[PDB]
Amino acid sequence: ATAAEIAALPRQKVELVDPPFVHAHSQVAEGGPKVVEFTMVIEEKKIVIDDAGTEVHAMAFNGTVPGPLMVVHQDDYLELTLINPETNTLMHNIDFHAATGALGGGGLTEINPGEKTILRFKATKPGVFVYHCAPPGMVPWHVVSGMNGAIMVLPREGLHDGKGKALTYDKIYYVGEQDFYVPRDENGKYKKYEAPGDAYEDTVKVMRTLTPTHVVFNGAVGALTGDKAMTAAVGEKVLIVHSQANRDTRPHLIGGHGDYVWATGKFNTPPDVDQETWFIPGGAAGAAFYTFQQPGIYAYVNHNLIEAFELGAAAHFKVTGEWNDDLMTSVLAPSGT
Amino acid sequence: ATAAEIAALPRQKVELVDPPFVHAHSQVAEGGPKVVEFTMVIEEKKIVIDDAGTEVHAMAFNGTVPGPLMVVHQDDYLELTLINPETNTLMHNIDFHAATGALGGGGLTEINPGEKTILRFKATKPGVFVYHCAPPGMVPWHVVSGMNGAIMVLPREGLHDGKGKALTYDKIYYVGEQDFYVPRDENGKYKKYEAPGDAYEDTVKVMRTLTPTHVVFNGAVGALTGDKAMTAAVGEKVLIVHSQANRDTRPHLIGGHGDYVWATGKFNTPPDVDQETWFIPGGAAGAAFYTFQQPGIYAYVNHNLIEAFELGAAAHFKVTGEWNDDLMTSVLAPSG
Amino acid sequence: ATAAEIAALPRQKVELVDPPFVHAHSQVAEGGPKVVEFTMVIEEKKIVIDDAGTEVHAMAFNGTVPGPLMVVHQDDYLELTLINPETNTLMHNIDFHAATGALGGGGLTEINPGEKTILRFKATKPGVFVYHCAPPGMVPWHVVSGMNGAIMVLPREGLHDGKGKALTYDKIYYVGEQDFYVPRDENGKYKKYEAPGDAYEDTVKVMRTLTPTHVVFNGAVGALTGDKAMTAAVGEKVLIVHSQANRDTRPHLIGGHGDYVWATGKFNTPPDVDQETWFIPGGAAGAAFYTFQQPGIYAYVNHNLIEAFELGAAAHFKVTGEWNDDLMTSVLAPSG
Ligand SMILES: [Cu+2]
Ligand SMILES: [Cu+2]
Ligand SMILES: [Cu+2]
Ligand SMILES: [Cu+]
Ligand SMILES: [Cu+]
Ligand SMILES: [Cu+]
Known part of the structure; x- marks a missing residue:
């Protein structure tokens, strides 16, 4: 598809919901390809992970661990506005396993505190796929601090x-x-x-x-x-x-x-x-x-x-x-007996 | 199936054999669906597991680790009598991964020492499937003490x-x-x-x-x-x-x-x-x-x-x- | 195939290359079954595995970790000349997961330093397959010293x-x-x-x-x-x-x-x-x-x-x- 063709597609704004729930969607696609728009704000936040009160400094897409499930259909475009508020201390990005190129988007979404970015990719393959943060040199630390979620690309x-x-x-x-x-x-x-x-x-x-x-x-x-x-x-x-x-x-x-x-x-x-x-x-x-x-x-x-x-x-x-x-x-x- | 239809199915008792051997069975089913009856006695006993005399307090279905392989066919019923002798000191039960409901049967088979129970389930899916003990709050301890086996549900x-x-x-x-x-x-x-x-x-x-x-x-x-x-x-x-x-x-x-x-x-x-x-x-x-x-x-x-x-x-x-x-x-x- | 039938097959000598490269080959077989000939010399050598200068005593087929990829087609014969130089200190052999019999060839290829052996097996199954050293009583130690590689048997x-x-x-x-x-x-x-x-x-x-x-x-x-x-x-x-x-x-x-x-x-x-x-x-x-x-x-x-x-x-x-x-x-x- 050309730039003009993609610009002509309908846009749909989706409000995410917290896991384990999933935002409203249709299993069978309604109409042709769309650009489905999501927004997530990253929060570095203390969370408690057990009944004893054990704390983790979580790094949380949309404030939750895991990050929320984004649902689109094959050949829709997923357009994510990712925001790293100035209250955070670390740079963050996002790697969609569903996406093709630039380290799943990680290479194009490196945002410092006080910055935002908008990434669009074509969801070419149907399935459920991990997404996670991956800042060069600090990759596993962000992921095991909770900075990961998933998406579903329905046929x-x-x-x-x-x-x-x-x-x-x-x-x-x-x-x-x-x-x-x-x-x-x-x-x-x-x-x-x-x-x-x-x-x-x-x-x-x-x-x-x-x-x-x-x-x-x-x-x-x-x-x-x-x-x-x-x-x-x-x-x-x-x-x-x-x-x-x-x-x-x-x-x-x-x-x-x-x-x-x-x-x-x-x-x-x-x-x-x-x-x-x-x-x-x-x-x-x-x-x-x-x-x-x-x-x-x-x-x-x-x-x-x-x-x-x-x-x-x-x-x-x-x-x-x-x-x-x-x-x-x-x-x-x-x-x- | 109707109540009368289930009640009318033949019941067949099968004698088990210790692993790695497997009890007598036919690959192709002989006749129609049956209620296949097995009995297992739980034994708590010390076993030696290596060449250095290392001991484990085993919790063993039918006295063996693993428990014996039970073999049935798809849409048979497996009807197990599980016995926990009064000489044992722990409560035991059984979760059949082949079964549907009550935590695989675990919720229906919690037996203290000196108790027995009989569970029946319909083997609706063909395959080999784990079974294991699973007392609420002590699941992995029983399983890693050897209280697990498998069944085979042949097509x-x-x-x-x-x-x-x-x-x-x-x-x-x-x-x-x-x-x-x-x-x-x-x-x-x-x-x-x-x-x-x-x-x-x-x-x-x-x-x-x-x-x-x-x-x-x-x-x-x-x-x-x-x-x-x-x-x-x-x-x-x-x-x-x-x-x-x-x-x-x-x-x-x-x-x-x-x-x-x-x-x-x-x-x-x-x-x-x-x-x-x-x-x-x-x-x-x-x-x-x-x-x-x-x-x-x-x-x-x-x-x-x-x-x-x-x-x-x-x-x-x-x-x-x-x-x-x-x-x-x-x-x-x-x-x- | 009979001994005579195998002896009549074309032979092809292959020169191996260091991973991650793969020696020259054709995806579709060129002609009928052949006896494909490879030679590997085993080198016990120090390797440095990180930027802190950490050393491993590698045991390396063809001097590399992993050993090189050998490529044949299904129903070709793979004929390996394996050489253990007098400069080495240990016995080595080879188990091809692609092969059938004698522990994948391990039982027939035990060579002390100063020895060589030639093993031929029929590549009956298409796929990628691990190969590795496996001396009885020292199996994982050789494997995690880098003594392993793979072959590809193309359809x-x-x-x-x-x-x-x-x-x-x-x-x-x-x-x-x-x-x-x-x-x-x-x-x-x-x-x-x-x-x-x-x-x-x-x-x-x-x-x-x-x-x-x-x-x-x-x-x-x-x-x-x-x-x-x-x-x-x-x-x-x-x-x-x-x-x-x-x-x-x-x-x-x-x-x-x-x-x-x-x-x-x-x-x-x-x-x-x-x-x-x-x-x-x-x-x-x-x-x-x-x-x-x-x-x-x-x-x-x-x-x-x-x-x-x-x-x-x-x-x-x-x-x-x-x-x-x-x-x-x-x-x-x-x-x-
Ligand atoms: Cu990843
Ligand atoms: Cu289980
Ligand atoms: Cu092996
Ligand atoms: Cu991050
Ligand atoms: Cu038990
Ligand atoms: Cu070796």
Whole structure:
């Protein structure tokens, strides 16, 4: 497309919503290609990542860890206004894995505090894709400080299975998984720091062990539990988008399955089916489609169970509906032998 | 199906066999859907896992690590009687990844010592699937104490390749891989404990390092080597089911291949082919089909070779038959 | 094929080149099956792996880490002359993952210093495959001393996509990724040694942590940058072969994609498409095909970004050509 042709396209402004929710969109594209406009303000902010009060100086697209999910369709243009407020201390940029050129946009979006930039790219490939900050020389430090999210580029005709049958979800959640590396004192207690820069050296040391202290969804241990548990109903079709910008994960819905899983996150790559546990490598997003069949509580976890239940990588679903005794029944409840 | 239809299905009791062997079954289903009944007794016991007398307080389905492979067909029901003897000291349950609902059955099977339970579930999806204990608040501790196994839900018409041609194995083995986290004292000597609970705090500290002290097949270093090597013959077709309930592995048959590999373990997902090394994520089972072409000793490993050769994740096959010089020949033997 | 049939086949001697370059070859086979002849001399040598002067006692096929890429076509025979000079101190052998029997050739190629051997195997399966040294009882130590590489067995009709459409590359590069485990003294400084054997015990202690001190391409931090950055032009189709003999990796072309990726490395397994980041398990090779569409610098990384940017796993591409503003444009450059 020429400059004139792109200038002629309709523009659509989108208001982002905080994970694990996803901004309103249509699965099947409405009309021809558009320039879809998003704005994110970067916030360097203290966040608490566990019940003990452990603090991280987070670097947060739109003030959240993960950053929000942007949804467009294949061959739309994504136009991001990225703002680095003067209250911040560090330069920041953005690498969209969905994009082609200039280090995914990183080379064109280096903004100092008090600066903004507008990047446009053509979303040429359908799938879910990581985005993350990547300032030359400080790349992993920004990413493991929470400065990452994902986007979804839906096919113009919506999702299909590996054989051309339409797959239409009733709801979608975005689970951003974050490995944190929090320095400890000689008592083995987590350190707090006055400024983000104060924590750098101590944090790099932990990072180099390749052993996160916390592995969490939505920025904190237990973040997607209790009144923040995800929800569904028997018969409801749910898409769970999952990202990890730095480190491998292996999602599992305890009590369920991934009926269709785009484990590579790419929609032209046929999904795996009937999955127990799927695998998303560090630096990628994946998506699983499931129709709930049983009511009750589910745990959705990274199935390294140490990572899930010791380090924080467990969320819950609460599911309404009628129990199905055909699928499963307690023939004899726990009782004396 | 209607209530009367489910009630009318035949019930069949099956006797289990210890890993790496697999109980009697048919690849193609015999007759219609059945309720296949299994019984497993949970044993808490000290086991030695290496050549240095290192102990683990194992938590073992049916007394083995891994627990035994249960084999059914798609749309059968698996009806398990799970027994926790009064001599045990912990509550146990079971999560079948093959099952749908109540945390895979975990929510319905919490049994204290001196209790039993019977769970039935419909095996709606074909594949190999992990099962493991999962008491709320103590999940990884039970799993890394060896309380995990796998089942296989065969398609009613047996296995096929991606092009729908039948794949019929001559034999099947189940390799369960276990990451252990054994505490050490300040001299680097592995610690021993009187009761399982006594090891809890020290063990969790090791677990949180994400670095196992041992990675083993069939519950111990070298358990599937020497006189306990798996066997085959040139021309024989072998299915190797592999599981890891907590941690990634990357199986490899040294000297061979995975001709067809359901790396995700699910039979409705077409198998990868001609594989050198396949990948099974923690919390899953996979299966590899191979036709042996050469006699001799093979190593079957987790191909992180430190895990295989320093930490214990190496098995052998001993294969009989005629050498094939077309496939491989020493043109010049090692010489000056 | 019979012995006589093989003896009648054409022979072709190949001259190997140092990674990341690949020796001259044809994508589509030229004529029928041949016996393709390669020679490699093993060199035990010191390598410097970072800008702090950190040393490894490398054990290097053809003097490089990784060893060179050998390219044949399916159903060719690969005939390797392997030479262990008297100047070396250790026994070495070779396991080709592409080969069938005798532990991939390891059981037939054990050569002491001052010995050579010649191994022939039939390349029956198309794909990229790891090869590595594997002396019994010292297997991972040789592998993580850099004694590994890969081969490519092309289909005789060259590469195709999942739908049978031809994929023809303009350039090919081979990135061998290496995990190193370098001992440190009490002050956290990397130790140096004056013989490979002197480092064994200390190195094993680090290996057993499963935590590499360095993760590098082509034997050193920054090896494939600057004077050794890989190159292309807009429009050019490039195949990137990537291996890791011991440990998982997750390649990603920063600024680009893997248009087609044989993540398992096997050409009869249809490639994944439009990949952001692919995954290659330890003990395997994979291959990604991409057509460059933008000029400029790309980083090619293991996308554990700590591994890439703290531990060394980052390469660059330098790409010539015209910028495409349709694909990407700065609507407003960084400004107040
Ligand atoms: Cu990235
Ligand atoms: Cu599980
Ligand atoms: Cu190998
Ligand atoms: Cu940043
Ligand atoms: Cu248990
Ligand atoms: Cu060697």
